[PDB]
Design a binder for this molecule. Structure first.
Ligand SMILES: Cc1cc2nc3c(=O)[nH]c(=O)nc-3n(C[C@H](O)[C@H](O)[C@H](O)COP(=O)(O)O)c2cc1C
Ligand code: SF4
Ligand code: SF4
Ligand code: SF4
Ligand code: SF4
Ligand code: FES
Ligand code: FES
Ligand SMILES: [Zn+2]
Lengths: 62, 192, 434, 95, 79, 244, 56, 119
């Protein structure tokens, strides 16, 4: 599809659930084919958006 | 759950009024009468400790502003002091705040065993009160010589600033910690 | 004597009644001799006390070794308006050492009168006692003793029947290891973050409130009441040319019956551990390692722990100085890597994060210890660890960075084969399980 | 025939007042004359037996818009039989 | 000789007369010598890295600049 | 040897001008003028992160370390007062090692977000890392991260890339005059914020963008609009207010 | 070709390294912070007449 | 004016009457290094730029759009003045601002703050 702009297309992707306090995002599954590694400290009540990917991460429980 | 930021809760808000007490004014004046009048900021630590005792062991944002007003400084100069030190509980804590042994001089004799019992039996997640605020678990730093390995520290915030005590118990055991927690729940203080 | 620097006859000790034998509030203090003939002690000039300190050969106690008389001499002789304060480092930080809590609980008037003697020695104006926040009982006992002293008339205006006045106040911190530092003490007492300031503005020039102040340890000033009344030669002839004063020791660790009595400071480790505190758990045979002094000291193994003294010069010559003089023995039944890793984590926990080499270096050391404890590291990691410790030490604002780099350096200098064995067994397991 | 030997020889053999300044380095040997004794210097360097510089590689040019003598032309030379390189340069002007 | 040419073995064809035919023969012989040098370089090919390491004038490996801070800084300030 | 940037040394009295040696070179500086300023007069430029000419002097970040012959350990040139006749030299291998170690420590926890950093082309951290700093860092474990707070609609903050130099704190305390910014916490993990949800409401509060070397504090309206190298810089004056 | 993430977000973050390294000066980029919050390109065009396909 | 070099430079006579500014670029505020200072530049006022109405590119009609930026950097003010007068340009020199080194010691954060006199 191409009717949806990427800004409106990334928002519908469900946020990832992480058990820990910080999660490292590397883009693609292969580290060398994604963006530089980014450690995000997810502590607020809102999802933490990866600045490169746009992926969102939500902490469920410690 | 140690956070350096507020995210205001309905329990504690900056606009909520907070004074020390009618009787505590004498203590405030006495503690302020230790330093030169221009250096009223030197009493920030004792005033914060007194506010923590008066509130119940947890220091809210309103009491921080009240202390800042008393010493006539910017409010953040009190937030910095309160956050830096390890004896200013910023989140709500129960009346009898229990504590765990220190890391390097205590764990040598194998004191990790007791804290497992404290967190597992009759306990909830660390830093959390029960259905009602009675007990809580935190980290504690040893006074000195760990001549006795298992040591539990309690803080008496039940009676406020008048009945505030800071006692240390040595030779604690999974059964001894039990009998002491029911003794505290009953009300009578244990011996040390 | 000189062949052996040992033997306490139970009347050569200074801190009598350190077990709460008698009520140490006013009557016991008066009985043992506290507040005795203090009128002439403080009325016999000011430079006499400084000369007494200089010739008595007093050493820095409970911290960096430094001649106490020379340090006191740095205070201004004529005051250009700025009042002189005297803050006592009553903070008993670095857990594992309790040589000050016991003194506070059982000899309050000792230190309380030592404050007055030191203040008249350096023309001070007021005394500040900074007790830990976790010493509520000790603080209450000390303030009760101070209230009794105020009632008697030994302090305040016209102290001890002398024209000179004095003041002793009680300030209690809030439980930070860095707050025990000689400058973070002043920063916290000023009522702000307890982060040490830089060295060139020495406290003797501009300290508390910007006024010339001097920081002394509680037990370093608590031997001042007994340096004049009992004379200087009563203890200065106990030890070495500059190492004398009957330093207190707090033995602890994996040894049965841990005593805490004071002794001569030039005592061999073997004699002190097999005479007073029974013997090492399991005997002298195990004797994995020992730390002379507190937890801020480089490690000393079984090879060189014997036939050396608790003297600052010789211990420094064994690249492992004397700190607060509270040793912790290590037996063969406990791994030394885990204890040193826990020491590194303790240093990481209390670093006030001001200067860069300590702020991130103390965390990097902890991560390296966690990796190496289970053998997850490689063989080449030891040299990088040495380089990291060398980078940390010498570049920090205060000495905590050195205190955090010393234990790991001592471990990798005296227990390198243990790390190599752990690495080798991890590698062989890795190659065995496919 | 190497850098140092040529430096000694051209320091001794060359008549003075020709080379305003000279350099010796691994990058290249330089002979900065004074924009008038150029034909003479090149003629000597071409015909002398111990310096048989025969081929002129190129004539460079550098524009420095900060000095009084704005331009600076560079003469690259080469001695085939001695297997050595000499870089003679001057200072020019826009008029 | 600039690169590794002392190790390599080859001949330098030199003409006798300056006519065009000898230049053609010289070029043919130069092609022969180039083939010989290619064979020698193919035979004597060592292993190791291709980019320099002494100075910082080479980009970091794209599998390295994505997890290191100094490497990413070098990549940025070089490109 | 002209002073770096042509800075004019201010002599209150020519009699009070001590002489120090930087690198085989004597120079005259009056009372005060900590070692860093003595090198500034001598023409040698010293790396710095925390020291600013208009704010106070703080000894953290330990980057301006130099070597003095009469000194057991390297001293901070940004806070060491000038003494008559020192040997303050920076060419020694010990100074290079100290600077390399300090930069390794600074870049230990720095995030890899250079391509998205608004201060990418003009960052003081990477410019000094290229010049005064060893390559091929050794850190490989997880690096600390902190959450992005909110303060003002004209100062966009990303504190995961903050080196705790306390420059903004000192600016807010001294020059701005309103004390709403401060350094909270203890040890590695100390966030520099307000502890509440207040915004920076000061007249000259937008100057924290310039003083903060790394791209932690950057302007929000200009966020992600252009890079440094593609802007033509011209020097004009102001017309809004009468101070010109 | 401008590739994009498997999720659907475009891979370009307007870092402008390509614009600053292009020897032919073919690439012209204009960036802007989206209302989402992340940085992206609003105008990223390449002059294929200037481009030399050098792979820089 | 001594603009005889303008007759020989071959540049068009219309650009021989430009008004230029000679100045030393100031240190950028965002970065604390002083490595780009001490250099003087000639600032041709090439302020005429517009937008191509197909792709938004920036167009120019003035050949001196970036000459003074990319090239033509002088080491001294007198060199720039001599160059401008030789090429015949109405140069207007602008003096550079320089920071003033004031005495500031570390032991200034710790003062008396005054005596508690009644106020
Ligand atoms: C990080 C750090 C913490 C310290 N904590 C204490 C302490 O808790 N108690 C103490 O007596 N000395 C402590 N010291 C040593 C101090 O330097 C010492 O108290 C002070 O210099 C007075 O020395 P003196 O006993 O010779 O008078 C500490 C030093 C450092 C670097
Ligand atoms: S070395 Fe550590 S404890 Fe000492 S000032 Fe620096 S950060 Fe603070
Ligand atoms: S602040 Fe500097 S080093 Fe950090 S990401 Fe931005 S440009 Fe890179
Ligand atoms: S926000 Fe900027 S100025 Fe403030 S401490 Fe961090 S790096 Fe320094
Ligand atoms: S701006 Fe250019 S180099 Fe940077 S991500 Fe986008 S296409 Fe790639
Ligand atoms: S040694 Fe156990 S609590 Fe400190
Ligand atoms: S620049 Fe001097 S210590 Fe930071
Ligand atoms: Zn990502």
């Amino acid at each position: 599809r191409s009717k949806k702009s990427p800004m409106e297309l990334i928002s519908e992707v469900p946020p990832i659930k992480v058990d820990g306090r910080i999660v490292a995002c590397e883009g693609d599954t292969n580290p060398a084919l994604g963006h530089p590694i980014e450690f995000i400290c997810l502590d607020l009540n809102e999802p933490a958006i990866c600045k490169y990917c746009g992926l969102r991460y939500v902490q469920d429980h410690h | 759950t140690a956070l350096n930021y507020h995210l205001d809760s309905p329990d504690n808000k900056p606009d909520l009024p907070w004074e020390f007490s009618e009787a505590n004014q004498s203590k405030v004046k006495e503690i302020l009468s230790y330093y030169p009048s221009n250096y009223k900021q030197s009493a920030v630590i004792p005033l914060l400790d007194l506010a923590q005792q008066q509130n119940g062991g947890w220091l809210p944002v309103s009491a921080m502003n009240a202390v800042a007003k008393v010493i006539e400084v910017a409010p953040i100069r009190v937030y910095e002091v309160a956050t830096f030190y390890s004896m200013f509980n910023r989140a709500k804590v129960g009346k009898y705040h229990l504590l765990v042994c220190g890391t390097t001089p205590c764990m040598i004799r194998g004191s990790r065993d007791i804290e497992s019992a404290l967190l597992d039996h009759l306990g909830v997640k660390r830093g959390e009160v029960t259905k009602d605020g009675l007990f809580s678990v935190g980290e504690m730093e040893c006074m000195g010589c760990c001549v006795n390995a298992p040591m539990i520290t309690v803080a008496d915030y039940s009676n406020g600033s008048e009945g505030y005590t800071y006692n240390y118990f040595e030779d604690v055991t999974p059964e001894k910690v039990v009998e002491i927690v029911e003794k505290l729940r009953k009300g009578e203080k244990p011996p040390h | 004597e000189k062949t052996h620097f040992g033997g306490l006859k139970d009347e050569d000790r200074i801190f009598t009644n350190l077990y709460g034998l008698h009520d140490p509030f006013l009557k016991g203090a008066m009985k043992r001799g506290d507040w005795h003939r203090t009128k002439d002690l403080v009325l016999k000039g000011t430079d006499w006390i400084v000369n007494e300190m200089k010739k008595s050969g007093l050493r820095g106690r409970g911290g960096a070794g430094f001649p106490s008389g020379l340090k006191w001499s740095f205070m201004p002789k004529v005051s250009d308006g700025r009042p002189s304060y005297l803050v006592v480092n009553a903070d008993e930080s670095e857990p594992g050492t309790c040589k000050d809590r016991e003194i506070m609980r059982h000899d309050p008037h000792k230190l309380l009168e030592g404050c007055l003697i030191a203040g008249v020695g350096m023309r001070a104006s007021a005394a500040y006692i900074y007790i830990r926040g976790e010493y509520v009982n000790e603080r209450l006992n000390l303030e009760k003793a101070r209230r009794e002293a105020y009632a008697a008339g030994l302090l305040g205006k016209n102290a001890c029947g002398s024209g000179y006045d004095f003041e002793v106040y009680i300030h209690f911190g809030a439980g930070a290891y860095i707050c025990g530092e000689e400058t973070a003490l002043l920063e916290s007492l000023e009522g702000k973050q307890g982060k040490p300031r830089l060295k060139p503005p020495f406290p003797a020039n501009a300290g508390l409130y910007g006024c010339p102040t001097t920081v002394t340890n509680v037990e370093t000033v608590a031997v001042s009441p007994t340096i004049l009344r009992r004379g200087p030669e009563w203890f200065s002839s106990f030890g070495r040319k500059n190492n004398a004063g009957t330093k207190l020791f707090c033995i602890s660790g994996h040894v049965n019956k841990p005593c805490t009595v004071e002794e001569e400071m030039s005592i061999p480790l073997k004699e002190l551990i097999e005479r007073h505190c029974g013997g090492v758990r399991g005997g002298w045979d195990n004797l994995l390692a020992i730390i002379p002094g507190g937890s801020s000291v480089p490690l000393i193994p079984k090879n060189i722990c014997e036939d050396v003294l608790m003297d600052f010069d010789a211990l420094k010559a064994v690249q492992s100085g004397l700190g607060t003089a509270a040793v912790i023995v290590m037996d063969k039944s406990t791994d030394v890597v885990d204890a040193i890793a826990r020491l590194s984590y303790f240093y990481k926990h209390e670093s006030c994060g001001q200067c860069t080499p300590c702020r991130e270096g103390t965390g990097w050391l902890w991560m390296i210890m966690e990796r190496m404890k289970v053998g997850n590291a490689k063989l080449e990691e030891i040299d990088m660890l040495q380089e990291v410790t060398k980078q940390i030490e010498g570049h920090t604002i205060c000495a905590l960075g050195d205190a955090a780099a010393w234990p790991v350096q001592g471990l990798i200098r005296h227990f390198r084969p243990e790390l190599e064995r752990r690495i080798r067994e991890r590698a062989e397991r890795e190659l065995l399980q496919a | 025939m190497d850098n140092q030997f040529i430096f000694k020889y051209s320091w001794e053999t060359l008549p003075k007042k020709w080379v305003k300044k000279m350099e010796r380095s691994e990058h290249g040997n330089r002979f900065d004359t004074n924009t008038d004794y150029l034909f003479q210097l090149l003629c000597f360097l071409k015909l002398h037996t111990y310096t048989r510089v025969q081929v002129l590689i190129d004539i460079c040019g550098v524009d420095y818009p900060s000095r009084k003598r704005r331009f600076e032309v560079v003469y690259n030379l080469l001695s085939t039989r001695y297997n050595s390189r000499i870089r003679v340069q001057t200072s020019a002007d826009e008029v | 000789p600039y690169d590794v040419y002392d190790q390599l073995d080859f001949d330098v064809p030199v003409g006798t007369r300056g006519d065009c035919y000898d230049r053609y023969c010289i070029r043919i012989e130069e092609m022969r010598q180039s083939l010989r040098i290619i064979v020698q370089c193919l035979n004597q090919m060592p292993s190791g890295m291709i980019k320099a390491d002494d100075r910082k004038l080479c980009p970091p490996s794209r599998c390295r600049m994505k997890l290191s801070m100094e490497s990413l800084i070098h990549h940025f300030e070089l490109y | 040897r002209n002073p770096v940037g042509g800075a004019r040394v201010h002599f209150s009295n020519p009699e009070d001008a001590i002489e120090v040696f930087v690198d085989g070179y004597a120079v005259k500086v009056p009372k005060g003028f900590t070692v860093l300023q003595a090198c500034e007069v001598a023409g040698v430029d010293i790396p710095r992160f925390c020291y600013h000419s208009r704010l106070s002097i703080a000894g953290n970040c330990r980057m301006c370390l130099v070597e003095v012959e009469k000194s057991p350990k390297p001293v901070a040139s940004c806070a060491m007062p000038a003494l008559p006749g020192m040997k303050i030299k920076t060419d020694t291998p010990i100074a290079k090692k100290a600077r390399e170690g300090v930069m390794e420590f600074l870049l230990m926890n720095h995030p890899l977000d250079c391509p998205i950093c608004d201060q990418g082309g003009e960052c003081d951290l990477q410019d000094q890392s290229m010049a005064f700093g060893s390559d091929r860092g050794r850190f490989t474990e997880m690096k600390r991260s902190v959450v992005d707070k909110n303060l003002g609609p004209l100062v966009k903050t990303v504190m995961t890339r903050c080196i705790q130099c306390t420059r903004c704190v000192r600016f807010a305390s001294e020059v701005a005059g309103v004390q709403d910014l401060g350094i909270l916490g203890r040890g590695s993990g100390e966030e520099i914020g307000t502890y509440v949800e207040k915004l920076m409401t000061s007249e000259l509060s937008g100057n924290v963008i310039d003083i903060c070397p790394v791209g932690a504090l950057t302007s929000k309206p200009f966020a992600f609009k252009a890079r440094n190298w593609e802007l033509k810089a011209t020097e004009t004056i102001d017309v809004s207010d009468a101070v010109g | 070709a401008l590739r994009r993430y498997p999720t659907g977000e475009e891979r370009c973050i307007a870092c402008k390294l390509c614009e600053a390294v292009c020897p032919a000066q073919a690439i012209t980029i204009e960036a802007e912070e989206r209302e989402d919050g992340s940085r992206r390109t609003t105008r990223y065009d390449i002059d294929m007449t200037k481009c030399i396909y050098c792979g820089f | 004016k001594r603009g005889e070099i303008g007759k020989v430079s071959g540049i068009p006579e219309e650009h021989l009457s430009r008004k230029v500014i000679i100045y030393s670029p100031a240190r950028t505020a965002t970065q604390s290094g002083s490595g780009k200072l001490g250099k003087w530049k000639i600032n041709f006022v090439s302020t005429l730029k517009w937008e191509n109405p197909l792709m938004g590119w920036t167009s120019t009609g003035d050949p001196y759009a970036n000459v003074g930026d990319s090239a033509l950097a002088f080491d001294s003010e007198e060199a720039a003045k001599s160059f401008a007068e030789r090429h015949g340009w109405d140069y207007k020199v602008k003096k550079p601002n320089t920071p003033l080194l004031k005495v500031k010691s570390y032991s200034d954060n710790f003062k008396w703050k005054g005596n508690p006199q009644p106020e």
